Amino acid sequence: TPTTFVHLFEWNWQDVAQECEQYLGPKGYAAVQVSPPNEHITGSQWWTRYQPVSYELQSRGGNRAQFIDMVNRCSAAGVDIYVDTLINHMAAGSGTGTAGNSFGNKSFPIYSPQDFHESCTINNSDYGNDRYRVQNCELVGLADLDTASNYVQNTIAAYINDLQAIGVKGFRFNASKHVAASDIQSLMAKVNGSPVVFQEVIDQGGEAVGASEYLSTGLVTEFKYSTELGNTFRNGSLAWLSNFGEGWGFMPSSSAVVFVDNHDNQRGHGGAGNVITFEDGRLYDLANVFMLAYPYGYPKVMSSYDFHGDTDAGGPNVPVHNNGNLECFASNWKCEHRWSYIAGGVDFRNNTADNWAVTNWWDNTNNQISFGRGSSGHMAINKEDSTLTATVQTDMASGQYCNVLKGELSADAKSCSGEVITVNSDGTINLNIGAWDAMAIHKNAKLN
Numbered sequence: 001t002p003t004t005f006v007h008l009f010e011w012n013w014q015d016v017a018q019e020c021e022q023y024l025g026p027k028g029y030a031a032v033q034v035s036p037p038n039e040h041i042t043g044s045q046w047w048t049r050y051q052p053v054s055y056e057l058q059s060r061g062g063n064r065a066q067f068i069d070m071v072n073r074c075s076a077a078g079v080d081i082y083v084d085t086l087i088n089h090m091a092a093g094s095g096t097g098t099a100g101n102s103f104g105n106k107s108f109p110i111y112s113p114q115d116f117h118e119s120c121t122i123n124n125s126d127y128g129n130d131r132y133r134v135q136n137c138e139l140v141g142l143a144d145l146d147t148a149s150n151y152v153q154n155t156i157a158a159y160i161n162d163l164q165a166i167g168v169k170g171f172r173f174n175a176s177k178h179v180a181a182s183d184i185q186s187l188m189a190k191v192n193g194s195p196v197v198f199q200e201v202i203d204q205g206g207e208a209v210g211a212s213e214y215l216s217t218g219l220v221t222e223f224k225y226s227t228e229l230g231n232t233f234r235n236g237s238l239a240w241l242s243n244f245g246e247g248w249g250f251m252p253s254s255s256a257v258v259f260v261d262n263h264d265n266q267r268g269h270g271g272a273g274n275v276i277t278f279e280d281g282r283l284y285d286l287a288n289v290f291m292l293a294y295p296y297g298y299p300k301v302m303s304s305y306d307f308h309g310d311t312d313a314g315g316p317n318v319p320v321h322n323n324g325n326l327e328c329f330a331s332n333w334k335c336e337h338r339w340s341y342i343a344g345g346v347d348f349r350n351n352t353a354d355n356w357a358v359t360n361w362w363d364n365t366n367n368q369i370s371f372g373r374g375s376s377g378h379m380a381i382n383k384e385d386s387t388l389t390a391t392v393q394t395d396m397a398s399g400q401y402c403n404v405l406k407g408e409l410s411a412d413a414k415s416c417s418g419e420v421i422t423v424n425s426d427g428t429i430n431l432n433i434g435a436w437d438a439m440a441i442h443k444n445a446k447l448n
């Protein structure tokens with residue numbers, strides 16, 4: 001069962017199409033979030049994608065034909081496409097777009113100055129006490145669309161419906177806290193069918209606008225998850241995670257989209273240094289293992305590029321699939337979705353989807369934890385400086401299983417490529433996990 005999606009940040013359409021066929025489909029990823037495919041301002045910075053000029057599908061990722069090719073190929077491989085949709089604003093200032101269209105003074109190919117709110121600036125203090133300014137003023141000078149206007153709603157809905165017609169299955173509504181939830185309710189009434197929609201709402205608490213206001217229009221990004229997980233893995237105790245989720249004050253599990261990090265917070269935009277990213281190596285593997293094994297929310301794995309400290313920089317000048325070479329793991333594309341522990345965690349989640357409970361939780365009161373998903377699977381993380389050798393109880397059938405974080409079961413089910421884990425006749429496992437390592441086993445990776 002598909003349970004996890006991935007964000008292939010700044011990947012062009014040809015690269016995404018091949019990745020769906022060679023990796024994502026076979027490994028079981030449910031979908032892919034792509035960078036904004038609509039016309040945007042020229043420039044090499046990654047953020048140019050968030051300044052639209054029109055809704056024509058001509059962007060840094062490729063042209064319309066290439067985009068369509070990608071949706072078809074991915075769809076054939078069993079992988080959905082989620083489009084990052086800009087519903088709050090248009091580009092700032094004046095210039096030219098990726099399809100040749102020029103714009104200026106709040107005048108675009110599809111919008112006139114009267115289709116925007118009167119200009120004003122959102123100040124940092126407005127988030128805590130002025131809901132009106134947060135939703136009607138400009139975010140960093142971006143022209144603010146009059147989202148209450150029937151013309152504007154019809155225009156955005158037509159783009160969304162056009163994308164569904166092509167075959168797109170879902171949408172990420174970017175900068176949603178800056179649009180009144182009621183404006184989104186009206187917009188959705190114009191959208192055909194019921195696609196998967198997740199709204200980017202950054203709410204850490206104490207804001208004039210809350211994430212709970214968006215629960216009725218689709219899923220919502222739970223940013224507290226990313227910050228609390230990072231804070232616990234770096235400065236707290238893993239034993240504290242025994243009741244992670246609604247117990248910590250997060251939104252309902254069935255409404256939340258979660259992640260260890262995202263494209264914004266891994267570079268400072270809306271997230272502090274406690275956020276864990278690819279730069280943290282093994283800490284990142286372990287954080288992902290917990291997230292994928294834990295039954296809270298709909299997770300999305302991050303897929304980045306080494307930005308070399310430059311937070312405005314765009315991606316590598318070389319494709320991922322470069323003439324038979326995979327430009328992964330080095331100083332170009334990081335390809336975290338291909339990392340053994342992460343891919344292994346996705347497999348665990350997919351195979352324990354018939355039991356969403358946390359059973360037999362165990363911890364050493366600090367950084368050693370273990371828990372199961374009933375008879376469907378069991379896992380353990382060791383973040384202490386010495387070997388975890390405790391005997392833990394599971395609800396699994398006795399036998400030998402592959403630690404899917406380090407390998408996989410052969411086609412004939414007679415061998416594993418990584419270490420074997422034994423479940424004794426009484427259901428117990430005598431653990432043997434080194435410092436900063438983990439293990440996960442499930443009922444569909446049992447040796448014959």
Ligand SMILES: C[C@H]1O[C@H](O[C@H]2[C@H](O)[C@@H](O)[C@@H](O[C@H]3[C@H](O)[C@@H](O)[C@H](O)O[C@@H]3CO)O[C@@H]2CO)[C@H](O)[C@@H](O)[C@@H]1N[C@H]1C=C(CO)[C@@H](O)[C@H](O)[C@H]1O
Binds near residue numbers: 050051093174176269
């Ligand atoms: C016009 C504006 O362009 C750039 O701003 C970027 C952000 O740096 C980038 O993070 C991204 O913003 C997203 C944000 O991270 C996310 O939380 C939110 O939900 O969605 C945002 C995208 O919609 O994209 C924007 C837009 O490209 C520059 O970094 C900014 O400096 C720049 N502001 C300029 C321009 C003007 C007016 O001409 C001044 O008012 C402004 O002070 C100046 O700095």
Ligand SMILES: [Ca+2]
Binds near residue numbers: 135136145179
């Ligand atoms: Ca707005």
Ligand SMILES: [Cl-]
Binds near residue numbers: 200221262
């Ligand atoms: Cl997000």
